[PDB]
Write a protein that binds this ligand. Structure first.
Ligand code: HDD
Ligand code: HDD
Ligand SMILES: [Ca+2]
Ligand SMILES: [Ca+2]
Ligand SMILES: [Ca+2]
Ligand SMILES: [Ca+2]
Ligand SMILES: [Ca+2]
Ligand SMILES: [Ca+2]
Lengths: 673, 671, 355
């Protein structure tokens, strides 16, 4: 796909960058025990390269991972958009997607609580088109000029740069409580959507209203929703924290492995479509990026399939260097006057100058389009092209008037939706139509199941208890109280403040479909889910049991890890390196019951893996018939939902696989009365 | 100080642009109240352009780290051994800035990764800035600087998928170690508790290389720098470090920040081993070889002065992120040696600042400026902050009367190369045969550790090598480990189900050396700043009473006390939900809380007990004050397990436990 | 000078932009281009670019960051820094504000206003306002440039445009390039004039201080250097910058003929003691006379001081009665007359006109 730019080093002698054969293992010295010589060009070229390997990390979404794939259209969408990539049933377009967290630096953990990026480039036959989205459909703020305020507040305090990848500190909650627009996204981030089980188990949203524009100039208002075919799933917070330490690379590894195993993730690329006349018809302003359109008002239309099926060859060249822009737009799509979107258009063209160090960043392989380029852009640091046209100005006669202007009527030009207008004073004023910051956060909260509501309350209790300023904590309660008095009381209880009196102005009992993770039902597929089989080398029969289970589990596309004290044929991991965060379900073979002290692993390790998996809600069980020794030691009830005990390997697996699809047994978590 | 002059106060005043025009920055300028944003909105673009350009490349190595300001005070007039001005008088004070770091992780990676740690110290002397860019381990992995990109590529994440972060626990790292046997000495150090220090304050600093001290008369001696912690040496255990990485990625930078804010700034004795030039090969190895220590039995330490860190930075980016260290920042009285690792570093640190700063005037950043006048003919360059009055910046000149004047051994206190230094022989890209013993000193190190310390090192290797996929790499690893110690090769092999190769006794020996063991270094000389978690409950007025009494008795001894309960209130610092054993050096349960150890919506199931059990398992002093020990399966007569009804008696015993720091009898040993 | 980074976006309360689409886009370019020049975002911190008042904002970090900011809560709105810095606007803190009467209305368009369509009447207004010799110079500048254009089509296209401003300009330019001018197109022709755009018609200079006078002298004759010295004294009194030129340097001589040129002077005087100069290994053949002749041809005041002028003036083919040509024995009288010529500046009667 980028094959043309690949460099192979599987054979050959070492050369400099100018193809002179050299060595690179010993410096040139004046005598065998002498000083190194300035004339050693082999040394200096290699070290200068190394000294300059790093580029600035992205200002936000610095931590992330990418893959290549394909988008396939389900129809000819000409009747709603001129977009070429959408113009025929089965039309294919290459894509590259990068997923990310938002706040943390390079190297911070995948499993921080955060808003996640989901940025998709379509390399279309009429230019690159990017949709730079998040896993949450609403943003914290209503005007792009506020972005540095939001980001400074959630990033580490700038005197000591603490804490990494976390909103659990005074400045973040000061901002949230002073800027009430933040409530909706905050409720999403405090739900399971802040800690997704993988990039493959979350959705993607454009967030803003955009326009679809037909060739006749007519337009409709749209929202992009990329709906996961893997299902929605989250971690529990206590599991996310341990995973952040045991495997900071958990999400990138999950994606890489799914692709390598021929299980590339899929999404249906969808839109909600509404008329221009419906911009203020739903009880809020479609220009407001803190609002969703409830699906009860506008259903999803499926446009096509997005599948990721090829991993990069070089992470730096491809994933690190990919430079997304919402200004990478194509004919058939247009912007709206959403003031958050409007300012983004400036930022993403500017910020690539910082990353790339020069203006020719669209020339890097990963950023190039797959069609020819005809324009009068010239020179600049790192210019890779050798332009033939020696008259790069318009209008010209000396290059016969080429390149030609493209527009609505010639050359398939981009064109602004011609029905768009502006009126009124030039103002730095917020539309009063944006003023209701609380009804939709309540809508979201109402739409979660009871244990889901508890999890969200518990995330807030956790974070807010770490805020040192008692004035900030009180201001936080003030805002939460406007969304829900009950939320405010329950959060308050953990921080030993009293909630303020109920303020019912924005309270309501409406709900909306499709936002709950717990309520979204069993996963539609269990392929790629991870099963840890805890065994022992003490008993050759435990290994036999583990081997039998492996065969039966692998046949259904599960990733099986057999754990024992030491490695040997059939054993993948030792106890010392194993952890419950490594598995979606845990099985003990009954031949290993005795393990439930050694110099080979920490004290209590085999039992702790089982107890953790249980307490985090995972399917757990014992295969073989003798289960009471293990279940009693773990304090797990044999009759529990998501707890399995069978002698029959086949029967055990049948029941256990139903549990992997349920994914989490929410009845193991306590609820406020 | 260049820093005070550049401080900007924003505690009052109206918002302005960068050119002083009062503005607003909260709403974009639009054509109509629901209209599109205007290009003419200069307020928007200046603010967003700044934000868009806030980041700079992280350091190519040691990207994760944290700094503090302080002072160095000389103990003596050291003129008898060096011309260095900062060492020329008893009591002479020089400002310092120190940055500590890991090595392999990117700038947002965890402090408690297993790794070699940086300890870089700038002395802003009255004869120029002098940097000692050191590590917490006295030896390095490689013998020639040209190999640095090989080492670093091999330990950093695999370049197709950028996995794993901040870890040597992957095939490429062990492939490099096993193919490049010089790595063994540092590998052994990094696999010991020195790979996971308890804090920046509980580790030493080493210059690693042999340097020269040069007197004004031109004579020279060979030296090694050793910064010796006054806080004592202490490590984490690996299972604890892993949890900590997740629970608090900022643990070391927080520990340092807090110690300084509380008036407990950390201290080191700055020391040297000093030997004659004639002893370059007298100790059984070559002093030019950065993989070798001089055992303290052959050369004792001389204490030169006190380093104390006592002020945190004002802006982390401006000071910590932008500090640009160089071993090329050298002063009269100090010289280089022909160590091929040191030699190449001189080039790299001047060059790499161009990448970080984006231009050549990086020495003009306030944190990089000297504390004396600059007189030279360097001109122009992006970001030039000076206005030079000398319009004849060339030498030799008459039109500026010959200024600036040349400085040298006999004029202007110039730097000069040690005049006894020579070179002889062919111009070669050959390794000295004197560098060839890659295994005897790793064995010396291993021999010098205590039995449980040796067990911890074995277990670290068992952990990492079991994650290497390649059977071929694992076998090559055992081959090298076997050349250091057959017993190590056997014990590591047991974990990975391979057979160790037969004993090869070429480099085996039984010698030991003082000062390298953490466990063996005795109780900590101070317990100030150490953290005690008191596990209490709100459901008992007795529980919060017992907690409050303990707090008084522990706090007056300088300990940092965290009372933990179900919910916050007066006297309670942390909820169970946010608490973890990694947050404490000792854990105390008040007996009034015993019911919690037997479900709540306010914390995860079994959290109170898990804290106590984890703390015990990790070797910490633990106690019950006033079935808790039963519930935890903690033996009441265990060393570092305390059970008293008396508050004063409990605290006295417990604080001895804190000094002992770890109770190593709780860890299983290979037979 | 090299590092000063100007921006029309550096605006202050009391001034605002207009919807001139050239101005509008400049606002973007000048903020962006300093990133290229400075290589980083902190260019306003260079000394030449700093303001002379305090800066209070939440811009942070970036390569080359010279400030150490004390405020550790750089976001708005905040309570942890007591809401500082405060927002400035029309009603508080002397904020900049957009003129509140400004509006926009209509479609979002990439269209040119038809009010911009007359490209030719004002060029003709300007041309009409120049003096006859000034018009000739402009025609001569176009004849020079267009003659160097290789494309005959481009040259034809150039005459089509020029012709829309002035048929006479097109005809006169066409003449130099051996093309015919297209037929008169009178849509935008007119006879109107405007004040203050002509150089030639703006009258004598209001001051001659700093103007340059080259005195051509010789070392052969002690009398020539004495004349040059007296002239120097009288001319320096009036703030003129005097250069005495001779074959070689010595006390009172500033420049050799080898390095001297008429372009170095606003007026040129030969002292009559130097008449014989008007071959040496010391300067190119004919250099002294060439300086005088060039000065005359380019319109400058020129003269001979000392009483004997005919030898020099005849050698130069310069008429003794010409305007801007001076000859007096009296230093005082010479200087008085010559200084009038320096204020006149250029004697435009020396240039040929199209007929
Ligand atoms: C005006 C500033 C601004 C605002 C309001 C936003 N962003 Fe942004 N975003 C940036 C300024 C920016 C940036 C500084 O320009 C970044 C950093 C690196 C880059 O290429 O662009 C960026 C990066 C970035 C990435 C990483 C792309 C990648 O993987 O390389 C994603 C997914 C988003 N953003 C998504 C959003 C969404 C869903 C927003 C609200 C709807 C949003 N951003 C508002
Ligand atoms: C030839 C390359 C090379 C070699 C052989 C070394 N280093 Fe280095 N080191 C660098 C090239 C480098 C560098 C790329 O130049 C860095 C990155 C950031 C910087 O300022 O310099 C650096 C950074 C750096 C830092 C971070 C300083 C700070 O906190 O900002 C420390 C502590 C060390 N190094 C210590 C060492 C030690 C103790 C070495 C062996 C004795 C060593 N380095 C060998
Ligand atoms: Ca904070
Ligand atoms: Ca959930
Ligand atoms: Ca258009
Ligand atoms: Ca690897
Ligand atoms: Ca240890
Ligand atoms: Ca640059």
């Amino acid at each position: 796909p980028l094959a043309a730019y690949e460099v192979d080093d599987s054979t050959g002698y070492l050369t400099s960058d100018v193809g002179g054969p050299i060595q690179d293992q010993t410096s040139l010295k004046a005598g065998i025990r002498g000083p190194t010589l300035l004339e050693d060009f082999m040394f200096r070229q290699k070290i200068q390269h190394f000294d300059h390997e790093r580029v600035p990390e992205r200002a936000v979404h610095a931590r992330g991972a990418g893959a290549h794939g394909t988008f396939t259209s389900y129809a000819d969408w000409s009747n709603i958009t001129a977009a070429s990539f959408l113009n025929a049933t089965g039309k294919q377009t290459p894509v590259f997607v990068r997923f990310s967290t938002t706040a943390g630096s390079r190297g911070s953990a995948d499993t921080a609580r955060d808003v996640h990026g989901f940025a998709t480039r379509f390399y279309t036959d009429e230019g690159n088109f990017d949709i730079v989205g998040n896993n949450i459909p609403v943003f914290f703020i209503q005007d792009a000029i506020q972005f540095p305020d939001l980001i400074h507040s959630v990033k580490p305090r700038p005197d000591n740069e603490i804490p990494q990848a976390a909103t659990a500190h005074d400045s973040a909650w000061d901002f949230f409580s002073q800027q009430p627009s933040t409530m909706h996204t905050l409720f999403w981030a405090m739900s399971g959507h802040g800690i997704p089980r993988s990039y493959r188990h979350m959705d993607g949203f454009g967030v803003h209203t955009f326009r679809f524009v037909k060739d006749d100039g007519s337009s409709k208002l749209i929202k992009w929703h990329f709906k996961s075919r893997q299902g929605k799933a989250s971690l529990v917070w206590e599991e996310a924290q341990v995973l952040s330490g045991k495997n900071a690379d958990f999400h990138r590894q999950d994606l890489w492995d799914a692709i390598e195993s021929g299980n590339g993730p899929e999404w249906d690329v969808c839109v909600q479509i509404v008329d221009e006349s419906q911009a203020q018809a739903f009880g809020f302003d479609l220009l407001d990026p803190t609002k969703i359109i409830p699906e009860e008002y506008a259903p999803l239309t499926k446009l096509g399939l997005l599948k990721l099926d090829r991993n990069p060859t070089n992470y730096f060249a491809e994933t690190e260097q990919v430079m997304f822009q919402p200004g990478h737009i194509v004919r058939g799509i247009d912007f709206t006057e959403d003031p958050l979107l409007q300012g983004r258009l400036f930022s993403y063209l500017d910020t690539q100058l910082n990353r790339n160090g020069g203006p020719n960043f669209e020339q890097l392989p990963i950023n190039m389009p797959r069609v020819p380029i005809h324009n009068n852009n010239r020179d600049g640091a790192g210019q890779m092209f050798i332009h033939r046209n020696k008259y790069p100005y318009t209008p010209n006669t000396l290059n016969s008037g080429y390149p030609r202007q493209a527009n609505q009527n010639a050359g398939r030009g981009f064109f602004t939706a011609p029905g768009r207008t502006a009126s009124g004073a030039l103002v730095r004023e917020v539309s009063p139509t944006f003023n209701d910051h609380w009804s939709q956060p309540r809508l979201f909260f109402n739409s979660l199941t009871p244990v889901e509501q508890q999890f969200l309350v518990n995330a807030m209790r956790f974070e807010i208890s770490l805020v040192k300023s008692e004035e900030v904590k009180k201001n936080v309660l003030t805002q939460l109280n406007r969304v829900s008095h009950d939320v405010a009381v329950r959060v308050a209880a953990a921080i030993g403040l009293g909630a303020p009196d109920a303020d019912d102005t924005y309270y309501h009992n409406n709900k909306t479909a499709g936002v709950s993770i717990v309520g979204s039902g069993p996963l539609p597929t269990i392929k790629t889910l991870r099963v840890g089989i805890l065994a022992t080398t003490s008993e050759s029969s435990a290994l036999d049991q583990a081997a039998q289970l492996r065969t039966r589990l692998e046949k259904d596309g599960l990733v099986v890890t057999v754990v024992a004290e030491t490695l040997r044929e059939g054993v993948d991991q030792t106890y010392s390196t194993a952890d419950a965060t490594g598995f979606d379900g845990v099985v003990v073979v009954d031949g290993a019951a005795a393990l439930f002290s050694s110099p080979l692993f920490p004290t209590g390790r085999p039992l702790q893996i089982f107890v953790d998996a249980y307490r985090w809600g995972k399917p757990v069980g014992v295969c073989g018939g003798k289960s009471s020794e293990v279940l009693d030691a773990a304090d797990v009830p044999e009759d529990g939902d998501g707890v399995y005990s069978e002698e029959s390997v086949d029967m055990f697996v049948e029941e256990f696989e139903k549990g992997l699809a349920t994914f989490r047994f929410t009845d193991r978590f306590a609820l406020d009365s």
